[PDB]
Amino acid sequence: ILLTRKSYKPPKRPLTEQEIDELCDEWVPEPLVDPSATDEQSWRVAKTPVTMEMPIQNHITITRNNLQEKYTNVFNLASNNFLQLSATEPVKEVVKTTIKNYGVGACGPAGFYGNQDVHYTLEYDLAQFFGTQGSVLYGQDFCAAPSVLPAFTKRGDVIVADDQVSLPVQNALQLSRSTVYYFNHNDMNSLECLLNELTEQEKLEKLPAIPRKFIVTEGIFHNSGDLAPLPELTKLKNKYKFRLFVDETFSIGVLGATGRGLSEHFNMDRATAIDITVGSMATALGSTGGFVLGDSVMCLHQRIGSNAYCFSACLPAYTVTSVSKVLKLMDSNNDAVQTLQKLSKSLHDSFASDDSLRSYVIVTSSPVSAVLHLQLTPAYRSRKFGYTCEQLFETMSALQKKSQTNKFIEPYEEEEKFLQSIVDHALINYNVLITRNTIVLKQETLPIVPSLKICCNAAMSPEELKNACESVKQSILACCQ
Amino acid sequence: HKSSMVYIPTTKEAKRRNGGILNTIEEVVEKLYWTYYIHLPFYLMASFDSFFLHVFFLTIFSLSFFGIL
Amino acid sequence: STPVTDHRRRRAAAVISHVEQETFEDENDQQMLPNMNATWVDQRGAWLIHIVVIVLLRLFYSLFGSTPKWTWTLTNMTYIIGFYIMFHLVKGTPFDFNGGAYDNLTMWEQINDETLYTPTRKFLLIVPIVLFLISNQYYRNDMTLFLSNLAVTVLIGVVPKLGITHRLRISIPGITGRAQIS
Amino acid sequence: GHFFVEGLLGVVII
Amino acid sequence: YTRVPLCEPEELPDDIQKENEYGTLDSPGHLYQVKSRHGKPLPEPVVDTPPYYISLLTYLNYLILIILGHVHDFLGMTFQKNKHLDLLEHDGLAPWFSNFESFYVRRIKMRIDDCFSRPTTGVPGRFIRCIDRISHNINEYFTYSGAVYPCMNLSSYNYLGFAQSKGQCTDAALESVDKYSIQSGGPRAQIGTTDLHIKAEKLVARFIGKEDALVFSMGYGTNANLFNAFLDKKCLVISDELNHTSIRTGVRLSGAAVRTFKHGDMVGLEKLIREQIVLGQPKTNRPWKKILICAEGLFSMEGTLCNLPKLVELKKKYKCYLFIDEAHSIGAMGPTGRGVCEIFGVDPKDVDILMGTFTKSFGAAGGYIAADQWIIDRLRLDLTTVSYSESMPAPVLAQTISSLQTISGEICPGQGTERLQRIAFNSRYLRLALQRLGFIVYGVADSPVIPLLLYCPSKMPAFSRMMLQRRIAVVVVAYPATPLIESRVRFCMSASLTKEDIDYLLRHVSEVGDKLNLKSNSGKSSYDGKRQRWDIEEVIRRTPEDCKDDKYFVN
Ligand SMILES: CCCCCCCCCCCCC/C=C/[C@@H](O)[C@H](CO)NC(=O)CCCCCCCCCCCCCCCCCCCCCCC
């Protein structure tokens, strides 16, 4: 027994209260937030438009910097309401009748009460219009994906995601707690290689029960703006037995002969091509909320185990009745999607055909997108700011990894100020309001570069848009020189 | 200040509306029934299982009475 | 092809192995919420119910008429097997906790957030031995019953609950199957 | 041996 | 016939509707003006308990249920795998969800599923209209007739009775619909801001007592996306063990270390703070960069409060930070409706961040965050929902502004104090009457959440169905939500309920709880120490004058 001991050392004594007290009194915490760079960054708050006593229509009256600037009859090109069917008189009447018959709030979560018959009617209408079996409603679009995706994945599942997905999808992936791989952003070769390697390794591992498998992508990308290849995706997910998750916020109501989404654009059936679809009632349908389209088993399990659904209040009844009316109107005599498609085509042709700008900016959006994006042609970006996208990515990623409290990067801020100068010139001189892509770069975890943004909707005269395009073109040329 | 609500009378009111000791016999019988039924999970089971459970408890009670007698 | 986020579950590549300790995120997920699965143990009446179920089993088996030795051995084996099935067989939680966070721990290891030799663990250790001592006075004259009961007790009701078998997985080929370590 | 086993069990309980 | 119908509104001349949504006051003695506590902390809770045989019976019930459920699962999956195609693999595709991690849902709540998620219609006011359903094969699927009947509402969050359709706020909402729109442009940081948002932010900041505030379109989202913005993985969070789910999601999405302390225990909190300051970060033992303490104004499953004075003392002594979630407190508690700071006389400057929602007591949707100035500027520059998610609509903002002005006494001055005193009286009256009859009731005296304990899994469907048969709508909760040994019904009292309604409810509850063996109150829940089994008429007669004295309330 003695010879089989382990040669330890007598343990130290436990700290007495006074040592604890002095050590506690020595500690110094940091401030909640970092006020070091609140001043050199706060121009964004000072340059945000504020429309007053008017809807957000085509011609607006705005003000900037706390009633210190004013502009009237400004042409608006920064609104996400593409169809503008929600301002028509029938929808106004439906809203007023609903508000008089019901209240304004629901007063309770879906679990107990406060799930009126209007909610069920809207869910049926959404399912019948888009083709699937059922759907569920969510309080807001931003909380749809991070609630749905963790309900169907956990530690032990595999997710294969695109190389540049929007922030809500990144949040969903991070909070899902599963293994995540990234493929090369519409490189079907890279996707096929990755799937083949994964399935061979799984076959070798001979697991008892096979796990869940998802492919995550987007319909029309939030930052880039380019289309997604659906035929190849469906084909190879059928071949390798994965499930497809498509987040199409910017395509429902924008793509298709009747605006029924991505599947109608590619002439397929949504019930056999896409498994989970996440939409938004706040961009094309001119309302508030979100939804998820699937089949009966998936919908029932969402009603049980999706957090945002069962721990938040149902959304007001006027929103759901207005959306139902809009769907009926889109079903009869559309003309609005068609107008939007022609306008978007002309806009993209206008900014893509020019050569005088072909050394400063590039057009990233596809011709079917209803919003036009621009960048700075990395040659010009390097020549005028002395930084490339890559080094920015590794800089910010390194800052996040060690978790430094103060994350300020100077070249990116200078380039952002340059872009805002471009916007300011056009606004002040020509009475045309375009927007900047508003990102919070200390939160992103995938490569991204600041850019511009020009939106169009289905209630503008083509000639006015042509003149506005000319004015923006002159503004870019003047500022860049 | 009338509203569009229909009120429902208390069971005592219903009995008073409808009017020997047989009623007390019935009430003690149903008291025993309700105690036994509610203190066991019969509302949460099905019908097949419920019946099986019933048979089980009746058998134990019968056998205990057999042994005591 | 390397994952940005490694959240992948490994399997035992040996015969005798231990479940690997958790990382920072896993510990945070486990400690973020009180475990609804193993918290009922410390509340009012748990020890009493462990006592009462034994008396109910004894009365049932005595109702089946048989001799005292048979009734008592049946009581002992039934209680021990039931306790093993409930507390030591199934691993995980019967409801969605988090990313899962307990997918490879049994209910016995989850008690008191993996703190050993607490008063409740002591009580649940003491119960089988005292139950054997009570029943020892009736089938003592049969070597076969005495030996079998003592074997079942010491091998099913005291060994899994020992402080050295914590996080111990035995994986043979053809019966148990590959256990889960990560 | 029975008293021996019982004494062992008491010891292990302690 | 299998799909929920789109029911039609009725004619109901204006007086009938006004009485349907908000009961007219009948007496001036049915009001109570609450007082403050002058900084005094909360006395140790005296939670009551039932006899032992009830606990033992509950344990037996759950044991039986679990055994049968697992046996059914095993047999059904192994033999009859023809009719279990949704839990099994199919052509090399794993099923949507595993059958063991959803055991409780199916095997225990698919038999009482008619007690949850009842469809309704119209305004969720004093009387709620329910659509009746017929259940087939033990709640496998429901079918719907065309009948609609009213019930007395005791389930929806309508504390001050602002959920109506004939008030002044509804007219404000209609005018906002006419003037602005029902549609928003985009995110706040891009085009989504109007002057109405600015007015609402200023008015909220003035109401609370802080310097600045923000408004969002969803409360869950607010909590989920705040800590992400202002925290990190080198900071520690000490949160109560009963906190809401949105706080947990928001803390989880950031990365910080988390530790929890027992509910309503302050010596443990101080001990934990000292120990965690001494220990430091795990694996490195470097000093913690930051420590944040999270809590709630009023926990709405217990009806209790948070010891705010002691929390402020501890945070000032150890240099921590404070975060308070006032979802059920704001608007419905305090002498003037300002929340827990009003209740305890604490200066609303010692609390670093305050958040709440407009859903409960304002009859609207959304949330807010109020703090000092520099904090608000940094967050507005840094928060994610400001930049990436859509702004909140105009009718909701109009309703919120109108109700806040009404409570603040700026418009129609008589209404605000009327509502506050009505709810304060109704809550106390119901709690005292129930405790005198012989039930077990949780929470402080003034809380509008009144949980009544049932303790047995088979008494819950019975209570719910009997009450529904007697035209009363209630809510029930079970094991995964509440401790295994305590299942309850929680009443939500509104300011739109008249004392006559409370008396009707009291009579029916007394009868049903007499029949279901629910009156198991001890003497630990009376000011004397003697157990009480009063008669219904006596308690009805003697309670209204006594419920005003702060002497009969042990809690
Ligand atoms: C084919 C014949 C097979 C044999 C019959 C069928 C047995 C197989 C079914 C049982 C499988 C159980 C699987 C795991 C169950 C639990 O762990 C789950 C999952 O963790 N926990 C929970 O749900 C959380 C706890 C919920 C409360 C459970 C405790 C309720 C009160 C029990 C107190 C302890 C009782 C004494 C200890 C166990 C003795 C069991 C004696 C069994 C025979 C008497 C009863 C029939």
Side-chain angles (χ1 to χ4, degrees):
Chain A
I1 299 299
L2 274 296
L3 202 163
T4 56
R5 274 291 321 150
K6 203 147 186 172
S7 88
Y8 72 109
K9 158 84 172 181
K12 206 59 74 64
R13 190 204 75 185
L15 282 168
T16 304
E17 301 88 33
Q18 293 82 17
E19 269 274 6
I20 307 172
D21 291 3
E22 63 181 2
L23 184 61
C24 291
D25 291 331
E26 183 178 1
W27 176 56
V28 293
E30 303 204 9
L32 285 173
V33 300
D34 176 37
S36 296
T38 304
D39 291 331
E40 65 183 1
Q41 263 175 334
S42 48
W43 49 276
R44 312 184 164 104
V45 183
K47 305 217 168 190
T48 294
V50 174
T51 177
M52 290 153 165
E53 293 83 4
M54 294 213 317
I56 305 175
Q57 38 184 319
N58 288 316
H59 302 106
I60 46 182
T61 293
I62 61 157
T63 146
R64 302 161 45 181
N65 204 8
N66 288 359
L67 299 166
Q68 289 176 6
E69 312 184 35
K70 188 163 179 186
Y71 313 90
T72 196
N73 203 1
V74 180
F75 199 55
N76 188 5
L77 291 188
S79 188
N80 275 5
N81 289 349
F82 303 124
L83 290 185
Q84 301 273 316
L85 274 176
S86 166
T88 57
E89 190 276 332
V91 184
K92 303 285 287 303
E93 301 286 90
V94 168
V95 167
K96 287 181 142 49
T97 306
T98 301
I99 295 190
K100 275 178 291 194
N101 283 352
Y102 297 67
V104 177
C107 310
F112 310 140
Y113 285 90
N115 210 351
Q116 270 94 0
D117 43 359
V118 288
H119 295 78
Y120 291 94
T121 313
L122 172 63
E123 286 188 8
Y124 300 147
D125 292 354
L126 269 177
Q128 184 185 3
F129 175 88
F130 280 108
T132 59
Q133 293 181 37
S135 60
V136 301
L137 302 185
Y138 275 90
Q140 82 172 349
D141 50 1
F142 201 69
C143 297
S147 313
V148 180
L149 191 57
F152 294 124
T153 55
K154 60 178 189 178
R155 301 176 213 258
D157 303 52
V158 176
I159 295 178
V160 172
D162 202 288
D163 208 23
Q164 62 199 46
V165 288
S166 46
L167 192 54
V169 184
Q170 296 172 35
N171 280 5
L173 298 177
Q174 174 188 356
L175 186 67
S176 172
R177 299 285 143 78
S178 58
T179 307
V180 174
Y181 300 91
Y182 289 98
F183 75 89
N184 217 35
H185 178 67
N186 289 12
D187 197 19
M188 293 296 104
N189 292 319
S190 166
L191 179 52
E192 210 157 13
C193 242
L194 186 47
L195 291 194
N196 196 0
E197 300 195 350
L198 280 171
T199 189
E200 286 310 328
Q201 293 204 120
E202 160 174 308
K203 207 162 293 273
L204 187 151
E205 182 65 26
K206 67 183 185 294
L207 298 149
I210 62 170
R212 314 194 205 97
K213 295 175 174 65
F214 288 92
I215 291 171
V216 178
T217 181
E218 300 196 0
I220 284 182
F221 282 77
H222 287 77
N223 300 333
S224 164
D226 50 336
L227 201 43
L230 192 54
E232 296 83 324
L233 273 171
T234 288
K235 199 152 305 170
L236 69 86
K237 68 93 174 179
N238 262 319
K239 180 168 73 175
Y240 281 88
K241 296 195 193 314
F242 271 61
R243 296 185 195 266
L244 195 57
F245 173 85
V246 162
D247 175 355
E248 46 178 335
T249 297
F250 277 110
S251 62
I252 275 171
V254 171
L255 297 191
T258 46
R260 300 213 184 194
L262 187 68
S263 74
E264 188 181 70
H265 174 69
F266 282 112
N267 303 315
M268 321 190 185
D269 182 21
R270 189 187 287 285
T272 76
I274 321 169
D275 288 336
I276 307 171
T277 309
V278 173
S280 190
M281 280 140 66
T283 65
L285 310 177
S287 186
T288 297
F291 56 85
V292 173
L293 315 170
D295 62 353
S296 296
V297 192
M298 181 214 97
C299 293
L300 194 62
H301 187 249
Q302 272 175 150
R303 268 150 197 148
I304 299 297
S306 179
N307 269 358
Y309 181 84
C310 55
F311 289 114
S312 67
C314 288
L315 72 165
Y318 77 85
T319 47
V320 306
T321 63
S322 71
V323 170
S324 281
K325 191 60 177 65
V326 163
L327 284 187
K328 211 187 308 171
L329 285 183
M330 271 175 28
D331 206 13
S332 288
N333 261 336
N334 47 9
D335 304 306
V337 183
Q338 315 278 19
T339 310
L340 174 64
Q341 306 262 32
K342 314 192 321 313
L343 276 168
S344 193
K345 173 77 172 178
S346 80
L347 161 57
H348 182 256
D349 289 342
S350 159
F351 280 92
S353 178
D354 197 320
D355 180 40
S356 297
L357 292 92
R358 204 166 302 268
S359 305
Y360 314 106
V361 300
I362 51 180
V363 167
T364 304
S365 78
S366 83
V368 295
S369 171
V371 64
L372 190 149
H373 303 240
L374 300 171
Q375 284 200 9
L376 281 184
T377 310
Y380 186 99
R381 165 178 319 116
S382 72
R383 194 259 289 170
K384 200 191 199 62
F385 302 104
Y387 84 110
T388 61
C389 196
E390 325 308 334
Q391 293 179 356
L392 171 56
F393 186 28
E394 297 100 31
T395 312
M396 181 85 267
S397 72
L399 286 177
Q400 295 169 3
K401 184 172 41 43
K402 44 183 172 179
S403 294
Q404 290 185 357
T405 300
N406 192 331
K407 314 171 174 55
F408 176 82
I409 291 187
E410 182 145 350
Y412 156 74
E413 177 79 24
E414 278 300 335
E415 201 205 26
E416 282 275 9
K417 259 176 276 200
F418 174 56
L419 286 165
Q420 182 58 348
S421 69
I422 301 196
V423 163
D424 270 358
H425 175 271
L427 167 60
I428 302 168
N429 288 116
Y430 296 106
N431 263 27
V432 174
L433 177 72
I434 68 165
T435 180
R436 205 177 72 257
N437 212 48
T438 299
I439 62 167
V440 179
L441 188 153
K442 67 179 288 292
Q443 298 283 25
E444 311 269 344
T445 61
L446 295 197
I448 185 172
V449 65
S451 52
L452 280 197
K453 199 167 171 166
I454 310 176
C455 318
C456 72
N457 57 6
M460 307 190 267
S461 51
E463 61 245 40
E464 212 167 43
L465 181 51
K466 184 181 192 72
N467 304 3
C469 290
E470 183 88 349
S471 303
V472 181
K473 218 191 302 293
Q474 270 149 14
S475 190
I476 308 173
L477 272 174
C479 200
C480 282
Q481 288 167 15
Chain B
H1 298 216
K2 194 142 291 193
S3 43
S4 170
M5 169 83 164
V6 293
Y7 288 62
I8 292 172
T10 311
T11 66
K12 294 211 315 176
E13 294 291 353
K15 300 290 185 180
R16 199 221 51 77
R17 256 83 161 184
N18 311 325
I21 75 178
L22 180 53
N23 59 7
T24 65
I25 298 303
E26 175 206 22
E27 82 174 5
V28 74
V29 162
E30 63 87 22
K31 179 70 176 177
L32 303 179
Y33 172 96
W34 269 115
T35 55
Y36 153 81
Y37 205 87
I38 67 172
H39 288 82
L40 304 164
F42 284 115
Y43 276 103
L44 296 202
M45 293 176 184
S47 55
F48 202 70
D49 307 330
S50 177
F51 178 85
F52 269 54
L53 199 309
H54 277 298
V55 168
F56 179 99
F57 277 103
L58 187 51
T59 286
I60 297 170
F61 167 79
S62 167
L63 265 292
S64 79
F65 181 77
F66 182 76
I68 291 309
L69 177 48
Chain C
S1 74
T2 183
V4 299
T5 61
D6 201 51
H7 279 106
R8 209 186 316 86
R9 305 291 213 184
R10 302 185 197 93
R11 314 199 69 75
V15 189
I16 172 168
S17 65
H18 284 267
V19 298
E20 200 165 355
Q21 190 167 160
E22 308 81 19
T23 64
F24 184 63
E25 288 205 47
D26 295 332
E27 201 206 30
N28 277 349
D29 270 344
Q30 293 184 347
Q31 283 274 350
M32 192 161 323
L33 201 49
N35 198 357
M36 240 1 2
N37 194 41
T39 297
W40 65 274
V41 180
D42 291 331
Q43 301 312 303
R44 188 208 213 204
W47 303 9
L48 270 176
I49 202 57
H50 275 102
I51 284 177
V52 169
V53 293
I54 293 172
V55 178
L56 295 181
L57 285 168
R58 153 68 152 79
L59 294 188
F60 195 64
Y61 286 137
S62 165
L63 202 160
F64 278 166
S66 63
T67 62
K69 51 151 191 282
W70 267 120
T71 63
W72 277 100
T73 190
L74 273 177
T75 288
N76 191 38
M77 311 265 288
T78 284
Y79 171 89
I80 289 288
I81 297 297
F83 195 107
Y84 184 88
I85 281 167
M86 265 195 60
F87 283 68
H88 292 111
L89 188 43
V90 186
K91 44 188 61 77
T93 61
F95 50 82
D96 185 49
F97 199 55
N98 281 55
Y102 278 109
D103 291 331
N104 54 8
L105 300 189
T106 64
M107 181 152 77
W108 176 262
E109 321 177 30
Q110 291 171 5
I111 298 181
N112 280 297
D113 60 276
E114 321 186 40
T115 292
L116 293 158
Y117 290 107
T118 57
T120 308
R121 289 183 182 274
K122 284 175 185 170
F123 177 79
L124 297 181
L125 288 172
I126 293 314
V127 168
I129 293 152
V130 182
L131 180 55
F132 178 73
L133 297 192
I134 301 299
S135 64
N136 184 33
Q137 314 293 330
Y138 286 85
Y139 59 87
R140 183 177 292 171
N141 294 0
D142 297 15
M143 248 352 344
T144 183
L145 287 192
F146 181 92
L147 271 183
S148 71
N149 274 11
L150 193 143
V152 175
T153 293
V154 298
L155 291 176
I156 293 172
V158 169
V159 166
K161 310 173 190 179
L162 281 195
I164 67 168
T165 47
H166 203 258
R167 294 175 161 253
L168 185 68
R169 308 282 175 257
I170 287 299
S171 187
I172 326 170
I175 292 297
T176 300
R178 293 207 205 184
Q180 188 149 285
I181 301 299
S182 177
Chain D
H2 298 165
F3 296 97
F4 184 73
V5 165
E6 295 189 355
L8 189 147
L9 287 187
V11 165
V12 75
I13 284 175
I14 297 169
Chain E
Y1 214 80
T2 306
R3 273 164 35 153
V4 190
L6 196 53
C7 301
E8 209 62 16
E10 296 178 353
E11 294 81 4
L12 304 184
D14 203 58
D15 295 332
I16 300 299
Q17 273 293 110
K18 269 201 151 283
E19 214 62 25
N20 272 9
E21 300 156 13
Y22 190 74
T24 306
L25 194 45
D26 282 314
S27 174
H30 296 155
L31 312 181
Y32 181 84
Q33 173 72 17
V34 293
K35 283 77 178 174
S36 60
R37 308 197 87 250
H38 292 75
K40 292 179 60 61
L42 302 168
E44 317 71 24
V46 184
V47 176
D48 202 350
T49 43
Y52 267 96
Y53 70 104
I54 296 298
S55 305
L56 303 178
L57 281 172
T58 304
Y59 280 114
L60 276 296
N61 294 307
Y62 269 113
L63 184 57
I64 297 176
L65 285 166
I66 292 176
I67 295 277
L68 281 71
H70 275 300
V71 160
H72 270 105
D73 265 5
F74 171 74
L75 281 194
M77 281 195 108
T78 295
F79 293 9
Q80 289 168 313
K81 63 165 44 186
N82 192 6
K83 65 179 73 175
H84 283 77
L85 40 73
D86 303 338
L87 272 47
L88 297 166
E89 306 189 31
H90 180 330
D91 291 331
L93 266 191
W96 277 109
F97 54 99
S98 66
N99 64 6
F100 172 62
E101 192 145 290
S102 71
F103 164 76
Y104 269 90
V105 178
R106 325 188 309 259
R107 288 299 167 188
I108 297 171
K109 207 157 84 64
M110 291 295 298
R111 317 231 166 85
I112 71 181
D113 186 74
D114 60 282
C115 299
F116 308 91
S117 80
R118 301 200 173 119
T120 50
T121 176
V123 181
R126 182 193 181 195
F127 295 135
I128 204 164
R129 288 162 66 200
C130 300
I131 309 183
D132 55 351
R133 327 176 270 175
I134 296 92
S135 46
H136 296 207
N137 314 347
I138 298 298
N139 308 163
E140 187 185 353
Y141 73 88
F142 306 87
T143 185
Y144 300 96
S145 173
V148 162
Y149 54 85
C151 306
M152 168 188 320
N153 196 12
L154 284 157
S155 54
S156 70
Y157 297 134
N158 191 17
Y159 294 144
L160 299 173
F162 276 123
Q164 52 208 355
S165 54
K166 304 284 201 32
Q168 68 288 1
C169 5
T170 293
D171 289 283
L174 285 186
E175 294 294 328
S176 174
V177 175
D178 265 357
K179 183 168 75 173
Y180 281 96
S181 183
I182 62 170
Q183 77 178 354
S184 50
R188 290 288 300 275
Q190 166 178 319
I191 202 169
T193 309
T194 53
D195 50 354
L196 205 51
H197 293 79
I198 301 299
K199 191 212 289 189
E201 293 185 9
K202 283 182 169 66
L203 188 153
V204 165
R206 198 174 76 242
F207 180 94
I208 293 290
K210 285 282 202 166
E211 307 186 12
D212 221 345
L214 283 77
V215 297
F216 312 107
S217 50
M218 191 205 208
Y220 190 92
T222 295
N223 268 314
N225 298 293
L226 176 73
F227 313 83
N228 170 357
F230 80 89
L231 277 185
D232 211 336
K233 71 182 293 294
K234 292 200 179 180
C235 316
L236 185 147
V237 174
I238 304 176
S239 71
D240 191 336
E241 76 171 12
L242 283 188
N243 272 356
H244 191 248
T245 303
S246 60
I247 298 176
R248 275 148 34 190
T249 291
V251 170
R252 194 150 81 96
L253 191 149
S254 50
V258 188
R259 315 261 170 240
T260 53
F261 61 95
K262 184 178 184 293
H263 182 231
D265 187 356
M266 292 279 135
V267 296
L269 174 48
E270 193 186 1
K271 186 189 328 301
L272 197 152
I273 288 186
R274 292 155 62 84
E275 155 195 335
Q276 289 302 323
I277 290 181
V278 166
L279 262 54
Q281 308 194 17
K283 181 266 299 189
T284 314
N285 275 43
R286 279 205 174 200
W288 281 120
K289 171 149 53 181
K290 212 180 304 181
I291 287 185
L292 177 56
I293 310 177
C294 293
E296 277 192 26
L298 178 138
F299 299 90
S300 66
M301 281 266 157
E302 299 272 328
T304 54
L305 283 158
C306 74
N307 213 319
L308 196 50
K310 191 146 290 300
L311 289 183
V312 176
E313 301 185 10
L314 286 178
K315 79 165 269 285
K316 285 212 301 288
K317 178 179 190 173
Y318 291 96
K319 315 146 204 160
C320 299
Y321 293 109
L322 209 60
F323 167 91
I324 298 297
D325 186 11
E326 272 166 290
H328 295 257
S329 297
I330 193 66
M333 310 206 97
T336 50
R338 259 61 175 179
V340 287
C341 285
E342 193 84 329
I343 291 183
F344 291 113
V346 179
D347 176 39
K349 177 175 101 183
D350 291 331
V351 180
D352 290 293
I353 296 171
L354 290 164
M355 74 92 62
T357 64
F358 305 119
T359 287
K360 267 76 175 182
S361 54
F362 294 111
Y368 70 81
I369 297 169
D372 289 328
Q373 181 73 48
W374 51 292
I375 286 178
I376 292 299
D377 304 286
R378 184 72 262 199
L379 289 187
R380 182 184 303 120
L381 281 186
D382 184 2
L383 273 182
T384 298
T385 186
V386 190
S387 297
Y388 287 100
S389 56
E390 38 96 26
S391 46
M392 65 180 288
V396 169
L397 274 169
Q399 163 90 0
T400 290
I401 290 171
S402 176
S403 87
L404 270 183
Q405 282 175 351
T406 287
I407 297 169
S408 189
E410 300 193 10
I411 69 174
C412 51
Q415 286 199 345
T417 51
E418 179 99 350
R419 296 180 192 263
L420 293 152
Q421 296 176 355
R422 278 179 73 143
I423 185 178
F425 172 77
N426 284 352
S427 311
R428 294 173 76 104
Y429 174 40
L430 188 60
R431 194 170 322 244
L432 193 55
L434 279 182
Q435 275 183 344
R436 274 176 176 176
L437 272 178
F439 294 95
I440 290 181
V441 179
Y442 282 3
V444 293
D446 287 315
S447 177
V449 180
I450 313 166
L452 193 152
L453 273 290
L454 300 176
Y455 289 120
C456 287
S458 181
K459 287 178 190 166
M460 182 178 72
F463 189 81
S464 188
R465 281 165 191 158
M466 278 201 232
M467 292 316 255
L468 184 66
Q469 183 204 140
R470 313 197 185 211
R471 295 295 174 258
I472 294 165
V474 289
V475 170
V476 288
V477 289
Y479 163 50
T482 65
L484 177 66
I485 206 58
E486 359 181 357
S487 56
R488 63 206 73 178
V489 304
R490 73 158 175 63
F491 292 117
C492 291
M493 181 75 48
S494 179
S496 43
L497 283 175
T498 291
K499 191 202 88 84
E500 307 285 322
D501 304 348
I502 302 189
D503 281 7
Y504 169 98
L505 166 80
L506 273 173
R507 293 200 188 97
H508 281 272
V509 169
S510 178
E511 178 158 83
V512 175
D514 189 358
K515 172 187 178 179
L516 283 192
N517 197 62
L518 285 164
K519 303 176 183 176
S520 67
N521 183 31
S522 181
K524 189 169 188 175
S525 67
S526 53
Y527 64 95
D528 297 311
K530 44 162 61 73
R531 94 174 205 170
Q532 313 184 290
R533 291 299 181 281
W534 293 26
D535 185 19
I536 178 62
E537 289 304 325
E538 180 203 350
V539 65
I540 278 175
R541 179 185 53 253
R542 194 134 71 248
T543 310
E545 61 295 7
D546 279 281
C547 75
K548 296 179 175 64
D549 299 334
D550 284 328
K551 169 176 56 182
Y552 306 95
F553 295 104
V554 159
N555 302 3

